[PDB]
Design a protein around this nucleic acid. Structure first.
Lengths: 212, 181, 180
RNA sequence: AUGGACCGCCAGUGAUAAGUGGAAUGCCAUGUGGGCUGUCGAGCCCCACGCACGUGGGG
């Protein structure tokens, strides 16, 4: 995998595209990668596949893509290929186990339930914590972290009209931030490259580390 | 004598001050007064010219004139006003002193400071070396056989165009008034 | 001789002032006099023409005339009025000097400075390079066999259309009066 | 189609040459912004595995 910083702007002066919706946003994220491979197995985490992090949404969007395919500049983008681009190996200095490395993990804590007049549904809420248990339970014995659970709202997603393109729903995303402790190198490595959680096309999953 | 303007754009900051009464009554803790005095800091540039001829004309003698100009220059550097100084001690010394003796016409370096200086860094060094550059190009554009000397409270840069760097303010003033007769 | 106007819109600045009086009568801070004097700063543009023909006619000789025009240009750059100077030393030298010798008609650069310049930045560089641009397009629109030279107190930009950059004001004046 | 019908006041021109508004000036003396404080379940759809408690994948 490798890392790049990008900033997408609105096509015209009437916000016809792209920031108007989330489906076009991820559309602008897949368009940049023409060639795409996709290998699946019975319910593991997906590795196809891109990862991105939205920092701020007040200047059309500030975004950071970490992925495997090379990102290519398109219409109404930065004044260069980037903002910035470089390769990165989770092999550098091996990311020594037992050594501390900072991190920034997005998430979407959920628990699934049977709902009346359903057609079972998943629910973003799982008094005294439950999301700590949820993420450190999914967070198998690799780099353990801290759990910064929040208590607010909200994220929406609607369709621009294209077929086979998700419609309108909401989803909460918790922004955990801290200093990962590495207890397993290949497990945290493969877990970062895959992406942590479902809906990798909506921002969740991306993990970035740092040094002491 | 010229007005002293900053070398960098400064906005005014509104100081909110309160006057508390030292004797308390029940049902209230209101202070004795409440206002907002304006204040501002910055690096001021200052300049002055002394027409020796006319001064010797007014005084008549030349020795009294020499004493008056020497004491004038020392008072120009030394003094600082007494305006709102008791509550905000701003007693300071000039970070750069450049006396020049010109025999044709006096000249000010104000245009050097027209282009305001943006900051987040210091302003003493930038103002000093920028005044240097302006004195250099100005010296090579209006050539004249004049005397130049300067003292400075910062030993980092060497200001060439400002003359021969004397050691201290009163020494500089003495040697320049001496060279000016 | 032309009037000197700023190259950018400037409003007047009122300066409240006071004349404190010694010998206090009531120990009051009452001062002998108060007022408000109007002042203003800015980057003035100045221009002047010397009709050689009529000057040689008035002087009669051609040698006396050359001395009068040379001293005229040097006094034009050097001097500054004496109006309210004892209270504000506005002695200065022109940051840009452009002498041109034209054999057909005199020309002013006033229209270049019609669109006022907005600021928050400096005005010396902007005014210099803008006068340059106007002299270039103006030179390629009214072609003429003239001599052009200029001195400048800023080594940042390169002013091409203003001629050959002489080294100093008196040198420029000597080479231009000579070419006249 | 009217005391009307048709019907040009009109062909030429420098307002001109000359001029400092100028000398003088502390806006000043006095001020707390203060007392109080843990950030710890309805969400739309598909598919896969499921001990029918749920778990993960793509929108």
């Amino acid at each position: 995998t490798w890392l790049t910083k990008i900033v997408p702007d609105l096509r015209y002066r009437q916000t016809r595209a792209d920031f108007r919706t989330a489906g076009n946003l991820h559309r602008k994220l897949i368009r940049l990668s023409s060639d795409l491979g996709e290998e699946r197995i019975a319910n593991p985490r997906q590795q196809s596949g891109l990862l991105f992090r939205i920092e701020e949404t007040r200047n059309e969007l500030y975004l950071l893509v970490q992925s495997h395919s090379p990102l290519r500049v398109d219409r109404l983008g930065p004044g260069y290929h980037g903002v910035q681009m470089r390769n990165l190996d989770p092999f550098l200095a091996r990311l020594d186990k037992g050594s501390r490395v900072r991190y920034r993990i997005v998430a979407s804590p959920t628990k699934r339930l049977g709902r009346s007049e359903n057609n079972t549904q998943r629910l973003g809420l799982k008094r005294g914590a439950a999301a700590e248990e949820w993420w450190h339970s999914r967070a198998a014995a690799n780099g353990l972290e801290l759990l910064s659970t929040y208590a607010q709202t909200l994220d929406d997603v609607r369709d621009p009209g294209t077929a086979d393109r998700s419609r309108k729903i909401r989803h909460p995303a918790v922004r955990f931030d801290g200093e990962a402790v590495i207890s397993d190198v290949d497990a945290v490595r493969h877990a970062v490259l895959n992406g942590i959680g479902r809906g990798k096309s909506y921002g969740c999953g991306l993990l970035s580390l740092a040094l002491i | 004598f010229a007005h002293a303007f900053t070398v960098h754009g400064t906005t005014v900051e509104v100081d909110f001050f309160t006057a508390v009464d030292d004797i308390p009554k029940e049902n209230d803790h209101g202070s004795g007064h409440m206002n907002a005095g304006q204040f501002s800091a910055g690096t001021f540039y200052r300049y002055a010219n002394v027409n020796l001829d006319r001064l010797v004309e007014n005084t008549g003698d030349a020795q009294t004139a020499r004493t008056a100009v020497a004491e004038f220059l020392r008072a120009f550097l030394s003094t600082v006003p007494s305006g709102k100084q008791n509550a905000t001690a701003a007693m300071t010394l000039p970070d750069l002193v450049h006396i020049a003796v010109r025999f044709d016409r006096p000249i000010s370096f104000a245009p050097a400071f027209e282009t305001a200086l943006y900051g987040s860094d210091g302003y003493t060094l930038r103002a000093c070396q920028e005044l240097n550059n302006y004195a250099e190009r100005l010296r090579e554009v209006w050539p004249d056989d004049a005397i130049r000397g300067y003292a400075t409270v910062e030993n980092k840069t060497d200001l060439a165009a400002l003359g021969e760097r004397y050691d201290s303010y009163p020494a500089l003033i003495d040697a320049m008034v001496a060279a000016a007769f």
